[PDB]
Amino acid sequence: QTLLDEPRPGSLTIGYEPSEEAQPTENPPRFSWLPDIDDGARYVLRISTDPGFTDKKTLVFEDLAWNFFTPDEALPDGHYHWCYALWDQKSATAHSNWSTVRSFEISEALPKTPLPGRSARHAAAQTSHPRLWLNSEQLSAFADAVAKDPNHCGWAEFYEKSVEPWLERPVMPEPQPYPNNTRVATLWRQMYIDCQEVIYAIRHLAIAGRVLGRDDLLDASRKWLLAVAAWDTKGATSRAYNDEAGFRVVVALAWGYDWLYDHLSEDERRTVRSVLLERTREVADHVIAHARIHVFPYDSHAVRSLSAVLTPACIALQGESDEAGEWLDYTVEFLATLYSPWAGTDGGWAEGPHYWMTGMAYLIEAANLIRSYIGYDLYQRPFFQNTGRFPLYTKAPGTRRANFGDDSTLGDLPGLKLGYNVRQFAGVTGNGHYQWYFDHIKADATGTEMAFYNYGWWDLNFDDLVYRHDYPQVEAVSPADLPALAVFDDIGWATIQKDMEDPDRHLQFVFKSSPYGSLSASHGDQNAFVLYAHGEDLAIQSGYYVAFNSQMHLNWRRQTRSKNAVLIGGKGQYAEKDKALARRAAGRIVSVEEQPGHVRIVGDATAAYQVANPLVQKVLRETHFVNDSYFVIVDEVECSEPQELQWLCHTLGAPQTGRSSFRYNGRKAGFYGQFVYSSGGTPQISAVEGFPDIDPKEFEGLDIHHHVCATVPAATRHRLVTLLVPYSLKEPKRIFSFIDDQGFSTDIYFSDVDDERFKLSLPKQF
Ligand SMILES: O=C(O)C1=C[C@H](O)[C@H](O)[C@H](O[C@H]2[C@H](O)[C@H](O)[C@H](O[C@H]3[C@H](O)[C@H](O)[C@H](O)O[C@H]3C(=O)O)O[C@H]2C(=O)O)O1
Numbered sequence: 001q002t003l004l005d006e007p008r009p010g011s012l013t014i015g016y017e018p019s020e021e022a023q024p025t026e027n028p029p030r031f032s033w034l035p036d037i038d039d040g041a042r043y044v045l046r047i048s049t050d051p052g053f054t055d056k057k058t059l060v061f062e063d064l065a066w067n068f069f070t071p072d073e074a075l076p077d078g079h080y081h082w083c084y085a086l087w088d089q090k091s092a093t094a095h096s097n098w099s100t101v102r103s104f105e106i107s108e109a110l111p112k113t114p115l116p117g118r119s120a121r122h123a124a125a126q127t128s129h130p131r132l133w134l135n136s137e138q139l140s141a142f143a144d145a146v147a148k149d150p151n152h153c154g155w156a157e158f159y160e161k162s163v164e165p166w167l168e169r170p171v172m173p174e175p176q177p178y179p180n181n182t183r184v185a186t187l188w189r190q191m192y193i194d195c196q197e198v199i200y201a202i203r204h205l206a207i208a209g210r211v212l213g214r215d216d217l218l219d220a221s222r223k224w225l226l227a228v229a230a231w232d233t234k235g236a237t238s239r240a241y242n243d244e245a246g247f248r249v250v251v252a253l254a255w256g257y258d259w260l261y262d263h264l265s266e267d268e269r270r271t272v273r274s275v276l277l278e279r280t281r282e283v284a285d286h287v288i289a290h291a292r293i294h295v296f297p298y299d300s301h302a303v304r305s306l307s308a309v310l311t312p313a314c315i316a317l318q319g320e321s322d323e324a325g326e327w328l329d330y331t332v333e334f335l336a337t338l339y340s341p342w343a344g345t346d347g348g349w350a351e352g353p354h355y356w357m358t359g360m361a362y363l364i365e366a367a368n369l370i371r372s373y374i375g376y377d378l379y380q381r382p383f384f385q386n387t388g389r390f391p392l393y394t395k396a397p398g399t400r401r402a403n404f405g406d407d408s409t410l411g412d413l414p415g416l417k418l419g420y421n422v423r424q425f426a427g428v429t430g431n432g433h434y435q436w437y438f439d440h441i442k443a444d445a446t447g448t449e450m451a452f453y454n455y456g457w458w459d460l461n462f463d464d465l466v467y468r469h470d471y472p473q474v475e476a477v478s479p480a481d482l483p484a485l486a487v488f489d490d491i492g493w494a495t496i497q498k499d500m501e502d503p504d505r506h507l508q509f510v511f512k513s514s515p516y517g518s519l520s521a522s523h524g525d526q527n528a529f530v531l532y533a534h535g536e537d538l539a540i541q542s543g544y545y546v547a548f549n550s551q552m553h554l555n556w557r558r559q560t561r562s563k564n565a566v567l568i569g570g571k572g573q574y575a576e577k578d579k580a581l582a583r584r585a586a587g588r589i590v591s592v593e594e595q596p597g598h599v600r601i602v603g604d605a606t607a608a609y610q611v612a613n614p615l616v617q618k619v620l621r622e623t624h625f626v627n628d629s630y631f632v633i634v635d636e637v638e639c640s641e642p643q644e645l646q647w648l649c650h651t652l653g654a655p656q657t658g659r660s661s662f663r664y665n666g667r668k669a670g671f672y673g674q675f676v677y678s679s680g681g682t683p684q685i686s687a688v689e690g691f692p693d694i695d696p697k698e699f700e701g702l703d704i705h706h707h708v709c710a711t712v713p714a715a716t717r718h719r720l721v722t723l724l725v726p727y728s729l730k731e732p733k734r735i736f737s738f739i740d741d742q743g744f745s746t747d748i749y750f751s752d753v754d755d756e757r758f759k760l761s762l763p764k765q766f
Pocket of ligand 1: 189300301355358407408452453520521547548
C-alpha cells in the first residue's frame, strides 16, 4: 500500500474542490484533485455525511481514470466529507492511504446537474451516421419538412448563400508553408480562413446533398473532402505548424466523414478515417498529455479545442477507435467538471467578452452536438444559465471601446456572434433581455458577416438554421427593468448599465481589478475603468488590434500605459509573456456597496504594481457612481519611498487641460475630470498625442487616439480624488465641490445645480 502524493497547489494549476474554502455550486459537486506521482494511475473517491466514512453512509466511486470527476446522481442535502486514494484495477481495491478529508455543504438551492456515467453515455449514443447535429431519423424527418416548405427554418436562405456558391468554386488548394517558417500575421490569418472555407464547402454541400437527396451535391462535397484528406498531415496545416488551420481541417474531415459516410466507398471511408484519426490524435495528445489541462488548465487554444475540435471529431469517429471513445469521455467529463478555468458560475469570462464570443461560439456547438448525440445537456449548469448577462453588461449595443482584454474587433460595434451567442442563451433560459440584445446587435451589425473575425470563424446562416430547428422562438423584452449594477465577483469585474434602450442616454461603465492579472487575454489593467456615457465612447480602450504579437499589442494594449489607470514612479503592472508572473500581477474587488444614487467599488491592485516595482506597498482605487450622473475616483498609494504618481485617461480626440482639470468633447457627448484633492500636491497636467514607441506603420491611415497625463510629484503617500462628470453636449453638466479636510478624515462635499449633495468621508490611512 503506497503513499499518496498530495502536492501543494500552484497559481497555474487546478485546486482541490470542493472544500470549506470553495463550496460546491452544483449538485452533485465537481471533484478535482492534483494527480499522484504515478502518471498512469486510477483513483477511488469516498463521500459521506459520516465523518468516520462508514459503509452504510459512504458513496464510493471506483476506477476513476481521471483526477477529476462528476457523479451521475445529485446528493441529498446536508453536511458532507470526501477523500480520494489510488485504486488498483485488477485487485479491485484501494492501494494507498486516503487523502486529507475535505468538507462541503449541499443545499436545495444548488442546481441539480448530474453527469451520466460512461456506461449510460456510451449506451445512449447512436451508431449509424449521421450523428453530428442531426441523426438518421431526424434527417429524414427534416428532409420531408423541407420538401413541404422550402423555407422551413430558413432553409432556402441557407441554401442560397451558404451552399450554392460552393458549386461554382474551385476546391481550395492546400495552403503553403510561410516563407522561412516565420509566422506572419497576414499569412497566418489567411491560412486559417482558407481552412474555414473548406469546413463550409464540405459541411454545407454534404448537408444539402443529403437533405435534398441530391447525388450531385454529395459528389461536390466528396471532391472537396478527398482533396483535403490528401493534404499533408505533417505539413503546413498541422496542429504544430498552425493550430488554427489544424483545428479547422479536422472539423471539415469530421463533417464530411459523418454525413458522406454512406456515399463514400470502402476505400474512401478508410482513407478519410485514417487522415481524420491521425489529425485528431495530434490534438488529443496535445490537450490531454502535453498541456494537461486537467492539471494546467490556463491554455487558451487547448481549452477551446475541446469543443471546437474534439467534440465534432470524437463523435464522428465513435466505435471506429477505442482511443476516440477515451478522448470523447475526457472531453465530455472535462466540460461537465472543470470547464471553464476562465470563469466562475457568476457568468463572467476573465479573458474578456471578445474571447467570450469565440469560447462560447464553439462551446455552444459542442454543447449542441453533445445534447443531440447522447442527450446530455451542459446548458443546465449555473455558469451557462448566467453567462448571457456578461456581454449584456460589457458589449452592450452601440459600444465600441468600453470593455477589457484582447479584442480582434476593437473599435467596431459589438460583433454579430455576440448577439447570436446570447440568443442561444435566450433560447436556453427563456430570458427576453437576451433576445432583445440579439435583435439589436444583429441589426446594428448587418453587412458585417464578411469581416475576418466572422467569416473566418462561423457561418451565421448555419448557426441560424441549427438554432431555428432545435430551439423555441423567444420574445424580446425591453431591457428597461435590467438592474443598473452587475458584479462579476469570480473574475473581479464590476459593470453599470443605464438606459440601455436609449441612444442618447445609454451609459456603460466597467471597472476591472482581476485575480487573473495579465494572464492570457487579460492586460496589465487592474484598477482600470472604461466609460461610455450619453451614447458615446468617452473613456476608451485605446489603440487597435492590428495583430497578435504586433507592437500595438505587446507594448501598448497589453501595457498599463494604454489604460485608464495610474502609473507609479513611471512604472506599470507586469504584462510580459511569463504567465506565472502575469497571474501573480493581480488585483481584486475588495467591496461593492449599493444604495439609491450611490454605487461604490473598491479595488486592490497592490500585487499588480509590485511585480515590476518592489517599492509599492498599497494600491487602492475607489470608484463612486453618484446619483446616476457622475463619478468620484479615489486613488490611494502607499510606497516605501517617494514615488511620483501618474493618472491616465484615454480619448479619441484631443483633450483640453486646465490647472487642475481636463475636458473632452466627442461628437455628441463629452466629459470633464477635476483633481479636487491631492495629498501629494497639485498634479501637472499634460495632453499626450499618439502612441509613443509604437511603430507608426501598424496604425497607418488610422485615427491616432489621445490621452491625458496627470502627474503628482514624488510622495510616499498619495491620496488623489478625481471628479468625473460626463454629459450630453447639448446639456453640459457641472458639479461643485467643497473640502472639509481638517480632522481625522478628509471630507469632500459635492453637489449639482439643484443642490443635491454627496458626502465623501475619506480616512487619512488605508
Ligand atoms: O488574429 C485574428 O484574426 C483573431 C481572430 C479572432 O476573432 C480571435 O480574436 C483570434 O484570437 C486568437 C489569436 O489569433 C492568437 O491565436 C492568440 O493565440 C494566443 C493564445 O490564445 C494564448 O493567449 C497564448 O498566449 O498563446 C497565443 C499564441 O501565440 O497563439 O489568441 C487566439 C485566441 O485564443 O483567441 O484573433
